[PDB]
Amino acid sequence: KPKLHYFNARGRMESTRWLLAAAGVEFEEKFIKSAEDLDKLRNDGYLMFQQVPMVEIDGMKLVQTRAILNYIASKYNLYGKDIKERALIDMYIEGIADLGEMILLLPVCPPEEKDAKLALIKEKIKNRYFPAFEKVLKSHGQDYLVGNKLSRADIHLVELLYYVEELDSSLISSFPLLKALKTRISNLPTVKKFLQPGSPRKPPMDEKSL
Amino acid sequence: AEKPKLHYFNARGRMESTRWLLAAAGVEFEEKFIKSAEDLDKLRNDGYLMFQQVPMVEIDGMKLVQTRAILNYIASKYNLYGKDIKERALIDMYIEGIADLGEMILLLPKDAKLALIKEKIKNRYFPAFEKVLKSHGQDYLVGNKLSRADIHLVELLYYVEELDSSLISSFPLLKALKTRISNLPTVKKFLQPGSPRKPPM
């Protein structure tokens, strides 16, 4: 059972929780509560770079979000079937991670910059990223982003749709195929269970958790 | 067949890691340099940039954007991405740490930021890779075989030297890796003048 080392928050660990849940993989989380508990991990040599996310899986102590995700995606066959399919997936999810990164860092923006930053996020959502993924879906007409089969690209994108909805439920309104992808993936058995109350899914980051 | 075409600007930027990787693999490539804001807009309106950005690389019938999608495909095609899923995890863990440090350096272009770059090099990143090389005592970071981790790290070793030549001095195995990799024939060519390798900006 994979053991997830982070703090009790979405942060850089949430996308891993989503991906494991969608693959129907149960995991334990060992929450950090203190600088004390983080230094315990560092001193015990558990963090190659002195950083979390860290995941204990299959004998390894994997740090770096993208090392974790790439490994979970291959293990459970959500990475496509060849390196040309992995290149489409990689191009998609790196666009997603670029937008996700902007959203993840909004609350820590300097207060005088937050209005512009959020404005920018919305402009790129509407003009850059959502048209890109809508055009992909319109291009093959299939139910999945790559290979007409479920992959990490669908999981990562739908996860981001939920965060855009939290920011502005109007932004997806002009994108019908993204809408239909959000509902179809949400109603996959493992994803629907993860979205239901009492799962490991984490809330938005309020102030005290901040 | 057609050799890959790199669409970027005439600078290191986010394309240099791809220049190093193709060259160390011994793959010849062309560069179509973006010289104006009008050149970027033509690539957009032609539909060549999924997210309207460069780096973009035309290879094997695709126009791949995002540095990491490009690198992942090239590393796999030319057998520089480990032999199994577990070796990939080690490589990925290593190279993403290198990316984190490379990212700070790439965006320096201050004294406050550079002072922090230097401290994290001496006490976080350089010890981490030295530990990996001491742990197994082999010539390459992963699997006792040249991999993209070695290429990406040694390229960064070069940029750290540009910033402060003393930062490597307490790390002998990083020094040795730098020498061995730089002496591989494809990398030694790429390091010689007149290669696509790009100067500091």
Residues of B in contact with A71 (CB under 8 A): 85-86, 88-89, 92
The string over B39-51, giving b where at least 16 C-beta atoms fall within 10 Å of a residue's C-beta and e elsewhere, is: ebeebeeeeebbb
- Contact, A17 vs A201, CB < 8 A? yes
- Contact, A169 vs A160, CB < 8 A? no
- Between vectors from CA A187 to CA A184 and to CA A189, what angle results, nearest 5°? 130
- On the CB side of B131, CA atoms within 13 Å amount to 12
Burial class (CB in 10 A: 0-12, 13-18, 19+), A148: exposed
Closest chain B CA to residue A49: B124
As a whole number of angstroms, the distance between CA A94 and CA A152 comes to 12
Q: Which residues contact A108 (CB under 8 A, 6 or more apart)?
A: none
As a whole number of angstroms, the distance between CA A90 and CA B72 comes to 8
CA nearest to A99, candidates A178, A5, A29, A208: A178
Same domain? A104 vs A183: yes
Resolution value (Å, 1 decimal):
2.5
The CA–CA distances, whole Å, from A65 to A2, A143, B56, B89 equal 14, 27, 24, 11
As a whole number of angstroms, the distance between CA A164 and CA A160 comes to 6
For residue A75, the tally of other CB atoms under 10 A from its CB is 17
Q: Say yes or no for a CB contact (<8 Å) between B72 and A63.
A: no
Same domain? B76 vs B94: no
Burial class (CB in 10 A: 0-12, 13-18, 19+), A207: exposed
> First vs last Cα of chain B: how many Å apart?
33
Same domain? B69 vs B157: no
As a whole number of angstroms, the distance between CA B174 and CA B167 comes to 11
Strand partners, A60: A57
Same domain? A153 vs A177: yes
Q: Which residues contact B179 (CB under 8 A, 6 or more apart)?
A: none
Q: Which residues contact A79 (CB under 8 A, 6 or more apart)?
A: A70, A73, A85, A86, A89, A151, A152
Q: State the DSSP string of chain B.
A: ----EEEEESSSTTTHHHHHHHHHTT---EEEEE-SHHHHHHHHHTT--TTS-S-EEEETTEEEESHHHHHHHHHHHTT-S-SSHHHHHHHHHHHHHHHHHHHHHHT---HHHHHHHHHHIIIIIHHHHHHHHHHH--SSSSTTS--HHHHHHHHHHHHHHHH-GGGGTT-HHHHHHHHHHHHSHHHHHHHSTTSS-----
As a whole number of angstroms, the distance between CA B114 and CA A68 comes to 29
Alpha helices in chain A (DSSP H): 14-22, 35-43, 65-75, 83-105, 114-124, 130-140, 152-167, 176-186, 189-195
Same domain? A114 vs A61: no
- Contact, B97 vs A123, CB < 8 A? no
Residue in the block written with tokens 């093959």? A140
Q: Is A26 left (phi over 0), alpha (psi -120 to 50) or beta?
A: beta
Structure tokens at B140: 């390459």
The CA–CA distances, whole Å, from B85 to A81, B76, B88, B147 equal 14, 12, 5, 14
Q: Which of B77, B85, B93 sits opposite A64 (nearest CB)?
A: B93
Torsion angle of C-alpha atoms B42, B45, B48, B51, degrees rounded to 10: 110
In three-state secondary structure terms, A15 is: helix
* Count of the separate structural domains present in chain A: 2
As a whole number of angstroms, the distance between CA B95 and CA B17 comes to 11
Give all strands of the β-sheet with B5-9 in edge-to-edge order: B30-34, B5-9, B56-59, B62-65
Same domain? A177 vs A90: yes
The CA–CA distances, whole Å, from A93 to A47, A101, A154, A164, A178 equal 25, 12, 9, 16, 15
Q: Is B79 on the interface with A (CB under 8 A)?
A: no
Same domain? B86 vs B128: yes
The CA–CA distances, whole Å, from A23 to A26, B19, B144 equal 9, 36, 33
Q: Which of A64, A86, A87 sits opposite B96 (nearest CB)?
A: A64
Closest chain A CA to residue B95: A67
In three-state secondary structure terms, A37 is: helix
- Between vectors from CA B146 to CA A82 and to CA A42, what angle results, nearest 5°? 90
In three-state secondary structure terms, A1 is: coil
- Contact, A76 vs A27, CB < 8 A? no
| Residue numbers of the domain that contains B28 | 1-80+184-201
Report how this structure was experimentally obtained. X-ray
DSSP one-letter code for A126: I
Structure tokens at A139: 């291009």
Q: Is A82 on the interface with B (CB under 8 A)?
A: no
**Is the preceding omega at residue A53 within 30 degrees of 0, hence cis?**
yes
Q: Is B41 on the interface with A (CB under 8 A)?
A: no
As a whole number of angstroms, the distance between CA A121 and CA B53 comes to 16
Q: Is A130 on the interface with B (CB under 8 A)?
A: no
Give all strands of the β-sheet with A54-57 in edge-to-edge order: A28-29, A3-5, A54-57, A60-63
Residues of B in contact with A86 (CB under 8 A): 72-73, 76
As a whole number of angstroms, the distance between CA B90 and CA B185 comes to 26
Which of B45, B66, B70 to mutate to test binding with chain A, by most A CBs within 10 Å of its CB?
Answer: B66
Same domain? B165 vs B193: no
Give the gap in angstroms from C-alpha B148 to the nearest C-alpha of chain A: 14
Q: Is A70 on the interface with B (CB under 8 A)?
A: yes
Same domain? A97 vs A74: no
As a whole number of angstroms, the distance between CA A51 and CA B102 comes to 17
> First vs last Cα of chain A: how many Å apart?
29
Same domain? A67 vs A122: no
Residues of B in contact with A67 (CB under 8 A): 89, 92-93, 96
Which of B96, B98, B121, B129 to mutate to test binding with chain A, by most A CBs within 10 Å of its CB?
Answer: B96
- Contact, B71 vs B91, CB < 8 A? no
Same domain? B166 vs B100: yes
- Contact, A85 vs A146, CB < 8 A? yes
For residue A209, the tally of other CB atoms under 10 A from its CB is 13
- B192 appears as a binding residue in the annotation: no
DSSP one-letter code for A208: T
- Contact, A209 vs A9, CB < 8 A? yes
- Contact, A53 vs A16, CB < 8 A? yes
For residue B135, the tally of other CB atoms under 10 A from its CB is 8
Radius of gyration of chain B (CA): 17
Same domain? B5 vs B65: yes
Closest chain B CA to residue A74: B85
As a whole number of angstroms, the distance between CA B164 and CA B150 comes to 21
Q: Is B89 on the interface with A (CB under 8 A)?
A: yes
Q: Say yes or no for a CB contact (<8 Å) between A91 and B66.
A: yes
Crossing angle for the helix pair A114-124 and A83-105, nearest 10 degrees? 150
CA nearest to B155, candidates B4, B23, B3, B5: B23
Q: Which of B69, B77, B89 sits opposite A67 (nearest CB)?
A: B89
Q: Say yes or no for a CB contact (<8 Å) between B64 and A95.
A: no
